[PDB]
Design a binder for this molecule. Structure first.
Ligand SMILES: *[C@@H]1O[C@H](CO)[C@@H](O[C@@H]2O[C@H](CO)[C@@H](O)[C@H](O)[C@H]2NC(C)=O)[C@H](O)[C@H]1NC(C)=O
Ligand SMILES: *[C@@H]1O[C@H](CO)[C@@H](O[C@@H]2O[C@H](CO)[C@@H](O)[C@H](O)[C@H]2NC(C)=O)[C@H](O)[C@H]1NC(C)=O
Ligand SMILES: *[C@@H]1O[C@H](CO)[C@@H](O[C@@H]2O[C@H](CO)[C@@H](O)[C@H](O)[C@H]2NC(C)=O)[C@H](O)[C@H]1NC(C)=O
Ligand SMILES: *[C@@H]1O[C@H](CO)[C@@H](O[C@@H]2O[C@H](CO)[C@@H](O)[C@H](O)[C@H]2NC(C)=O)[C@H](O)[C@H]1NC(C)=O
Ligand SMILES: CCNCc1nc2c(N)nc3ccccc3c2n1CC(C)(C)O
Ligand SMILES: CCNCc1nc2c(N)nc3ccccc3c2n1CC(C)(C)O
Ligand SMILES: *[C@@H]1O[C@H](CO)[C@@H](O)[C@H](O)[C@H]1NC(C)=O
Ligand SMILES: *[C@@H]1O[C@H](CO)[C@@H](O)[C@H](O)[C@H]1NC(C)=O
Ligand SMILES: *[C@@H]1O[C@H](CO)[C@@H](O)[C@H](O)[C@H]1NC(C)=O
Ligand SMILES: *[C@@H]1O[C@H](CO)[C@@H](O)[C@H](O)[C@H]1NC(C)=O
Ligand SMILES: *[C@@H]1O[C@H](CO)[C@@H](O)[C@H](O)[C@H]1NC(C)=O
Ligand SMILES: *[C@@H]1O[C@H](CO)[C@@H](O)[C@H](O)[C@H]1NC(C)=O
Ligand SMILES: *[C@@H]1O[C@H](CO)[C@@H](O)[C@H](O)[C@H]1NC(C)=O
Ligand SMILES: *[C@@H]1O[C@H](CO)[C@@H](O)[C@H](O)[C@H]1NC(C)=O
Ligand SMILES: *[C@@H]1O[C@H](CO)[C@@H](O)[C@H](O)[C@H]1NC(C)=O
Ligand SMILES: *[C@@H]1O[C@H](CO)[C@@H](O)[C@H](O)[C@H]1NC(C)=O
Ligand SMILES: *[C@@H]1O[C@H](CO)[C@@H](O)[C@H](O)[C@H]1NC(C)=O
Lengths: 772, 772
């Protein structure tokens, strides 16, 4: 199928439309730039290798390069692997880049460089030098960058990559960069705003530095600026997860009342962790276009009850005031200034970490007539009391977020406290109105708790303390609810009428409710599904279910059942036939996950007990030591079979004789040491096959007929025990010449032997002596 | 050191005092009895192999055998491995046992035998034939057993090993076994009590059968019987975890009032799962000695309120009345008859599964003057209300068990419901008075909850819903408490005064309280230990701890800290020095478990930050990819180092130069491929070394000096990658001749190659061609 096998250890992709030739050698354990890179290459990526040097030889033939991505070949010690430390900084020899007349983007982040690389071609639009050791910026070193438009210099002096001095920037070092639009000097030990900056700037990132004061004219000429981030200058250090040094005298970042007067195009202003105690209204007198304001992690608790500056922000879309509470103070209630009602455009309001005992409806009246408000986030406030009926006046909202509180009758998990959320490395909302009560202290629920909340589409009760026999009465008002997340509670399924009042429920999650399933003698009605007439997906993972009072689960609607992390091995104890049809009467079930059920064997009868339309079956991670492949004939609609992470040792003699429907067969991480002689014969309908991480030594053509292989959408073979003897000649030739997608050919499709060939890639194997 | 290497794949022990030669071939994957078993062998065990036959050659030379243990070489299908099913039942040829003039004990359980083996020697005292296929007992087949005292015939016809007919016993089949003391016919589909039985019987096991009625004279002659078990005849089938057929019309096992009149020596009567509705006092008229009565899994709920029979049981030690509740009945309270007060000798009372809402002090008054009472078990009753102060009248008890209830302001976990708790296979009580409130619904606690309970030594609150900031006030009456189990709650360690009122506390378990450690920005005072002045052991496993407001834990008493299952990798983020001394001021800490903390590397400063008297350190299961062995020099008292289940690839060049104190070094399940040339040179304090489950190919003599090997109590080497070439000549010879204890030589110290030798045990390897 190929006359010239590809030996290059990189992926090569063809973007005919914009004439791009993409060569991606990411994470190929290279110690040199590989030979034979195509001369037409436009995008060359060498990220995460151990190439110690660049020289004119490096890209000599590659005159068409628009982008070199050479990140993280020598990353700073505390940021990189401690098992493969980089011994010496990347060495760049003169005029390695000057021949590349078309080069627009150069990424050299994370190479321990000491100076800005010189000799760069004047076509360059983007230069990236994050996580190097460059902490002095001189005008002279920037002359080469006349046409530069995006310049990243951050992370060159901070606690994970120290330079032990203040960052240095020469007066007007950036000024004659007349095209520069984005400048990022974050995480750099910078002490003053650099001046004068070019008025072309649209984005300026100065956050996480040691700037104590803003001068009146620091931003005087920047009439095109759209994003300004000054966060983390004079940080609020309480409970900081990183080493945190505050400004002296509990000082805030000092910003003169007129400092932003020139910023008429500013759409985003970030003032997170600046220890602000006041927000002067005068700041925003000439900014009418501001859309996003971040004021989290300051000391604005009292300002929130006053907040006159809000009257100047009628175009604001997002307001963040999270974590402004006064230390050691547990307020009685939330005091929102009436000025919030002048925020006519607000869609997102976040006030986590205000820290107060009781929320009452009148406290939210300033928001009552904000017509665009879509998200109200009051998480992590330790609220003990809130009458949920209160939110009848907020039907228009998409998400009401009370997550992580103490109520009783999606942002990353580190978000407000992490050092740099934007550091670069080397859900039920769509169903409609969401009330998120997850991670609260709700121990008991009753219908009145949800009075006037009939409009709700998703209710998140995950991680409460609900330890209750539901009988169909607790959710009566929730007549529109489509999604209930009830995971991490203590559901007691005594009654098969549980949840039946949720007559429009489509998704139910009762995962991690194992408490009552763990003790003998307790009644469990797993047939509670019959009463849920539009239920589409049921999750009951990690419930430790090893017994059931009912012997069948019933549903004519359910299409997906997740049953992972239970004890079907106990339910299907050999000799006990009573539960072999547990799933049989889920007539429209197509996907069944019964991985992690300690199923070391399948008793006869489980396959005949499967419902008739089963399409996706997972039996992964069961410790399965044997498997009657012929029993797959009962599964007449089977398309995906996941047998990964087991102890299987054989494949079927004729996959076509076991299932002439199967498309995806996943056998990774088993103990298979050989294939049957006619394994895939006539298995035409097959499209995806994972044999990786087994012990296969040989594969002959009879097992892998090409009438089958070339309609394979992927074939995974890596991490086996291939023996590269003259018996392997067909397999080696076929692998070298096939166009079927096989991952990790360059890195993990390897001979274990004999001796000479140990560790050698099958792709590079020369077997001419077999033909002499 | 040995002139004749042992090649026999069995363990051989010498018990010089009792003149025993013990040969243990348990689970050696033998398909034949090995040659060369010592002629003096007295105890031979071949359990769990695949030896298909026994013949006169089997034990030909072994005339001194007192015991043959040949269990489970062909186990019934539903009881055995489905990956290695036994193809044909064990074959015993004639006269295989008659030459064994001293044979006292013969175990042939689980071999699918069809008849009682004939030709047995007249010395035999014990025959065991459980889990075979013998379901007709004839007097003729028993004549050979004249001297038998112990006969196990159960598990030959039941749902896990069906015979599809009723068990058959000939009239007086057992009568002429005049020495028989123990007869077990459990799990056999028996339909009547066999008669007449020999009057020597002391123990009769007839449980899990199909006996519907006892005849009035079925036990008439058994004036020596001490234990009678008739349980599981007419079973109580509700929520049974095995296929269960009740007698119909809800009939009980029918027992005439005089059926026990002859059993004057009876000490144990088991009537579990017999569907009893009454316990006639007349049953016990001539049983004056009964000590143990099991009446669990009947329908005695109403009888418990009357219970006139208890007046005839003044010597009873143990009474079990668990799971007698009426189906679908949730009683208001528990009604214990006054007759319980006549149980003068009672030590243990178990009444689980009575199922009632409210426990109150007056309900237990019949027990107030039972002076010998030690255990009151009221678990699994769904009690919602209980004033714990009532147990002030129960200071003499050792354990008050309210586990698994719904209270709100040690038996196996399958015990009452499993089919045969005695089926054979092929904790804080010690501190004093214990109140076990585990697995209840306690969400909030206050001091008054423990009013009058100052005598308690151990309190188990595990698995409740306590989601509360403790501040030192909640446990004030518990002035003698030595052990608090607070695991699986939702501890909020806001205050460093938590638990400080428990001034005699020695052990605290706060494991699996991860809830509030999972959300960012929440204050955690891990320095709460300072106030606990006699605390010896602290468990805080599986708390997901990744942040702390305090930087150090402090204690003058703590000796053991379990800190497993947290995120020290995040706390010790490279470049953040603030937590590197978290444990430094636990000045008396001797044991530290920080396994499972995602520590893929150890930041420098961790070892210098350890407290000075640390002796046992676990770093297991961390994904550790590298390790600076020289840093062990900081741990001048280190004796045990557990690095198991990591990714290490090297050992130190000279262990003695890293730690002068190290005695136990555990390196199992790593990636070590070779040892350093002088690894163990002069490591004179080393005593235990585990290198199993690595990738070692070769070991040379320089690495293993003999003056060090002579002090090793164990050296574990199994499951490596040994290369059995002429280069391995020292190691192969040394392994064959050493006296150092090396486990699994017979089974898992194996050549991986070259070719001819794959799978061969190095103990069997012949390398003479290397020496020609
Ligand atoms: C190949 O490299 C070019 C050069 O950087 C990439 O083109 C840039 O793509 C971003 C994505 O929107 C644009 O903002 C830049 O303006 C583009 N620059 C030019 C000169 O066109 C391109 O994305 C890369 N393609 C791949 C597949 O890596
Ligand atoms: C940021 O710059 C400060 C100084 O502006 C550095 O602090 C100095 O560090 C040296 C070397 O450790 C000390 O000897 C001086 O006493 C420090 N001076 C002051 C004024 O603090 C600091 O190390 C730099 N931070 C990083 C992360 O590189
Ligand atoms: C070796 O076999 C003898 C004979 O079966 C065992 O001796 C019996 O041990 C039990 C347990 O202590 C006693 O109750 C019996 O009284 C002993 N004698 C008989 C005739 O059964 C002995 O325990 C075995 N030893 C080992 C190490 O297996
Ligand atoms: C226990 O004995 C009964 C008979 O006393 C067995 O039941 C019979 O089984 C055969 C074949 O399965 C049926 O055709 C009969 O109808 C059954 N008879 C009755 C009276 O039910 C039963 O199989 C035996 N149990 C075991 C585990 O062997
Ligand atoms: C040993 C009990 N077995 C049956 C049983 N199961 C449960 C259960 N899951 N939850 C409960 C919650 C409250 C009260 C009782 C139960 C209960 N009961 C007892 C009864 C309702 C009479 O069936
Ligand atoms: C945003 C969190 N700031 C630190 C904090 N942690 C906790 C905690 N673990 N538990 C609590 C329980 C009740 C009320 C408050 C807290 C609380 N607070 C707030 C503080 C003012 C210090 O009390
Ligand atoms: C809220 O705070 C504001 C300003 O700090 C002030 O009007 C008043 O003290 C508070 N009002 C209420 C109703 O609590
Ligand atoms: C909660 O508020 C609603 C107002 O919609 C009211 O109907 C209900 O009585 C209140 N409940 C409590 C417990 O205050
Ligand atoms: C419910 O909230 C939990 C806890 O934050 C979250 O992990 C989960 O994804 C949410 N469920 C849905 C369906 O969004
Ligand atoms: C369900 O339980 C609720 C809550 O206690 C109760 O009001 C109602 O009577 C019960 N309904 C049924 C049908 O059992
Ligand atoms: C589920 O099975 C139990 C078994 O007794 C039965 O009581 C109940 O009627 C069944 N489920 C229904 C009716 O949804
Ligand atoms: C308890 O039940 C027994 C049995 O019916 C009855 O005789 C007795 O009067 C009851 N006593 C109480 C206090 O309920
Ligand atoms: C519990 O009983 C004790 C009697 O020892 C009494 O002092 C206390 O008031 C009772 N508590 C409650 C809540 O009834
Ligand atoms: C407390 O009870 C739990 C739950 O039953 C049990 O697992 C644990 O071992 C008990 N703790 C002690 C110290 O006995
Ligand atoms: C500790 O909490 C208890 C329970 O609310 C309270 O009574 C007590 O005053 C608190 N003590 C301190 C010192 O805050
Ligand atoms: C624990 O350490 C913190 C330091 O963050 C301090 O506020 C507190 O007083 C300390 N408490 C004790 C008991 O040492
Ligand atoms: C390790 O060995 C070197 C060289 O023999 C010696 O100088 C050094 O003191 C030793 N260190 C320890 C801790 O034994």
């Amino acid at each position: 199928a190929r006359w010239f096998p590809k030996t290059l250890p990189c992926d090569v992709t063809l973007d005919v439309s914009k004439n791009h030739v993409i060569v991606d050698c990411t994470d190929k354990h290279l110690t040199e730039i590989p030979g034979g890179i195509p001369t037409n290459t436009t995008n060359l990526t060498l990220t995460i290798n151990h190439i110690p040097d660049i020289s004119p030889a490096s890209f000599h033939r590659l005159v068409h390069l628009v982008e070199i991505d050479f990140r993280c070949n020598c990353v700073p010690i505390r940021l990189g692997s401690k098992s493969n430390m980089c011994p010496r900084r990347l060495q760049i020899k003169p005029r390695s880049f000057s021949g590349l007349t078309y080069l627009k983007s150069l990424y050299l982040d994370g190479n321990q460089l000491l100076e800005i690389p010189q000799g760069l071609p004047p076509s360059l639009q983007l230069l990236s030098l994050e996580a190097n050791n460059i902490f002095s910026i001189r005008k002279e070193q920037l002359t080469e960058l006349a046409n530069i438009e995006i310049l990243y210099l951050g992370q060159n002096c901070y606690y994970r990559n120290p330079c032990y001095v203040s960052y240095s920037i020469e007066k007007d070092a950036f000024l004659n960069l007349t095209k520069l639009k984005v400048l990022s000097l974050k995480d750099n030990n910078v002490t003053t705003v650099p001046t004068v900056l070019p008025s072309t700037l649209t984005e300026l990132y100065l956050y996480n530095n040691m700037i104590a004061e803003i001068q009146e004219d620091d931003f005087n000429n920047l009439n095109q600026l759209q994003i300004l981030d000054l966060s983390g200058n004079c940080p609020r250090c309480y409970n900081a997860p990183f080493p945190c040094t505050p400004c002296k005298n509990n000082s805030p970042l000092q910003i003169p009342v007129n400092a932003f007067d020139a910023l008429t195009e500013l759409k985003v202003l970030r003032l997170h962790s600046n220890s602000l105690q006041h927000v002067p209204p005068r700041w925003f007198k000439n900014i009418n276009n501001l859309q996003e304001l971040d004021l989290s992690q300051n000391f604005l608790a009292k300002e929130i009850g006053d907040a006159k500056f809000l009257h100047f922000l009628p175009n604001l879309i997002q307001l963040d005031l999270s974590f402004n509470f006064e230390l050691q103070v547990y307020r009685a209630s939330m005091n929102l200034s009436q000025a919030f009602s002048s925020l006519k455009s607000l869609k997102i309001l976040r006030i986590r970490g205000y820290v107060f005992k009781e929320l009452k409806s009148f406290q939210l009246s300033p928001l009552h007539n904000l017509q665009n408000l879509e998200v109200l986030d009051l998480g992590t406030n330790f609220i003990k009391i809130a009458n949920l009926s209160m939110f009848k006046q907020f039907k228009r909202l998409k998400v009401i977020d009370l997550s992580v509180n103490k109520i009783s009758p999606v942002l990353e998990q580190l978000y407000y406290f992490r050092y740099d959320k934007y550091a670069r490395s080397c859900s039920c909302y769509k169903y409609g109105q969401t009330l998120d009560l997850s991670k609260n202290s709700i121990f008991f629920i009753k219908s009145s708790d949800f009075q006037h909340l009939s409009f709700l589409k998703c209710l998140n009760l995950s991680g409460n303390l609900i330890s209750q026999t539901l009988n169909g009465s607790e959710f009566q008002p929730l007549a529109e609810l489509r999604y209930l997340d009830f995971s991490n509670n203590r559901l007691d399924l005594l009654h098969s009428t549980a949840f039946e009042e949720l007559r429009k429920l489509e998704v139910l999650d009762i995962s991690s409710n194992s408490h009552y399933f763990q003790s003998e003698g307790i009644t469990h009605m797993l047939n509670f599904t019959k009463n849920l007439k539009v239920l589409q997906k049921l999750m009951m993972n990690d419930n430790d279910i090893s017994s059931s009072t009912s012997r069948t689960m019933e549903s004519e609607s359910l299409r997906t059942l997740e049953f992972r992390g239970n004890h079907l091995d106990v339910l299907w104890r050999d000799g006990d036939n009573r539960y072999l049809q547990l799933f049989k009467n889920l007539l429209k079930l197509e996907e069944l996950d019964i991985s992690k059920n300690s199923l070391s064997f399948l008793p006869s009868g489980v396959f005949d007990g499967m419902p008739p339309n089963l399409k996706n079956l997972s039996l992964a991670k069961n410790g399965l030591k044997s498997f009657i492949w012929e029993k797959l004939r009962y599964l007449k609609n089977l398309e995906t079979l996941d047998l990964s992470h087991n102890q299987l040792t054989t494949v079927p003699e004729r996959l076509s004789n076991c299932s002439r429907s199967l498309k995806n067969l996943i056998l990774k991480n088993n103990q298979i040491r050989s294939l049957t002689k006619y394994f895939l014969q006539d298995a035409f309908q097959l499209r995806y096959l994972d044999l990786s991480s087994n012990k296969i030594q040989m594969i002959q053509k009879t097992s892998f007929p090409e009438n089958v292989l070339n309609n394979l959408k992927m074939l995974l073979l890596h991490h086996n025990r291939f023996l590269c003897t003259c018996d392997a000649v067909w397999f080696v030739w076929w692998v070298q010449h096939t166009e079927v997608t096989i991952p990790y050919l360059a890195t993990d499709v390897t001979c274990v032997g004999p001796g000479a060939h140990k560790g050698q890639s099958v792709i590079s194997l020369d077997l001419y002596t077999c033909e002499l």
